[PDB]
C-alpha cells in the first residue's frame, strides 16, 4: 500500500519508473509488483526533495538510467527481489551505483590509480651514509657547491633533514 497522488507530473514519473523496472522482464521471474515499488521509490524521493524541482527530476531520472543499465541487470534484480528497500534506493550507495562486479572493480581500481598518484609522491636524494649528531639516524643528505674557492674550499656539507641538523666533513 503506497500513497497515490493527484498531480499529473508525479503520476507520469511513476509510470516511467515502473517502465524502467519492466526492462528485461526480470520482474516476471520474481513476480513482484514493480508499479507499487516504483510508487514507493517516488514517494521516498519526494520525502527528501518535496518539490517538482529539476533536482528532484534529475535524481529520479538518474535513478531511472541506472535501472536501465544493460551492463548490470543484477542490480535491478537485487532491487526487484526486495533486498534493497525504496528508502535506501532513494540515496546512492555508490557514485553511480555499480556494485555487482564489472564497474565497481573498474571504479575501485581507478580509485587505486588516482590514489596511487599521491603515494610516495616522490622523495629522497639518497645516500644514507653519515649518522646524525642529534637524533642519531643515518638517513642524511649532502651538498656539493663552489669549487677551488679562496678560504672556504669545496667541502661536503651534510644535512639531516630528519631534524634540520647541519654539519660539514669538518
Amino acid at each position: 500500500r503506497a500513497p497515490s497522488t493527484s498531480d499529473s507530473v508525479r503520476l507520469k514519473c511513476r509510470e516511467m519508473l515502473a517502465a524502467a523496472l519492466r526492462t528485461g522482464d526480470d520482474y516476471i521471474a520474481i513476480g513482484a509488483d514493480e508499479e507499487e515499488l516504483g510508487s514507493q521509490i517516488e514517494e521516498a524521493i519526494y520525502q527528501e526533495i518535496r518539490n517538482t524541482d529539476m533536482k528532484y527530476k534529475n535524481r529520479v531520472r538518474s535513478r531511472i538510467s541506472n535501472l536501465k543499465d544493460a551492463k548490470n541487470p543484477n542490480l535491478r534484480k537485487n532491487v526487484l527481489c526486495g533486498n534493497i528497500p525504496p528508502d535506501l534506493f532513494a540515496r546512492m550507495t555508490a557514485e553511480e551505483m555499480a556494485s555487482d562486479e564489472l564497474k565497481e572493480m573498474r571504479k575501485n581500481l581507478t580509485k587505486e590509480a588516482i590514489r596511487e598518484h599521491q603515494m610516495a609522491k616522490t622523495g629522497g636524494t639518497q645516500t644514507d651514509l653519515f649518522t646524525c649528531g642529534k637524533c642519531k639516524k643515518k638517513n642524511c643528505t649532502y651538498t656539493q657547491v663552489q669549487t677551488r674557492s679562496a678560504d672556504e674550499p669545496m667541502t661536503t656539507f651534510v644535512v639531516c633533514n630528519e631534524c634540520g641538523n647541519r654539519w660539514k666533513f669538518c
Partner: protein, 96 residues
C-alpha cells in the same frame, strides 16, 4: 618496453632521467668510497685532505677512481644536434 611505471610525482621521461641519475651518482659514490678506503696512511694526498688544508674527498675520487656525470644547468648534456650530443654517437642514445 613501456613497462617502467612512472613515479607518482613525475612524468615517464622525468622518472627515467631521475632514475639513471640516481644510479650513476650511486655508482661514483661506491667507487669513490672504495678508493678512499683502499688508500694507506702515507698518501700525502690523504694528509692534505684530512688536515683540512686543501681539497676534499670528492677530489680524491676524481683523480684516482672516476670523474662521473658532467652537468649543465642542472641536467645531463643537452642534445646540441638533432637527438644527439656529439656527431660520434648514435641517435637517441640515452646511455651513460
Amino acid at each position: 618496453n613501456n613497462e617502467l611505471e612512472p613515479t607518482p610525482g613525475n612524468t615517464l621521461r622525468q622518472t627515467f632521467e631521475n632514475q639513471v641519475n640516481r644510479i650513476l651518482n650511486d655508482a661514483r659514490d661506491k667507487t669513490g668510497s672504495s678508493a678512499q678506503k683502499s688508500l694507506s696512511e702515507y698518501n700525502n694526498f690523504k694528509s692534505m685532505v684530512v688536515s683540512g688544508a686543501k681539497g676534499s674527498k670528492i677530489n680524491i675520487s676524481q683523480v684516482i677512481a672516476v670523474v662521473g656525470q658532467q652537468n649543465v644547468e642542472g641536467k645531463r648534456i643537452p642534445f646540441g644536434f638533432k637527438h644527439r650530443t656529439l656527431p660520434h654517437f648514435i641517435k637517441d642514445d640515452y646511455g651513460p
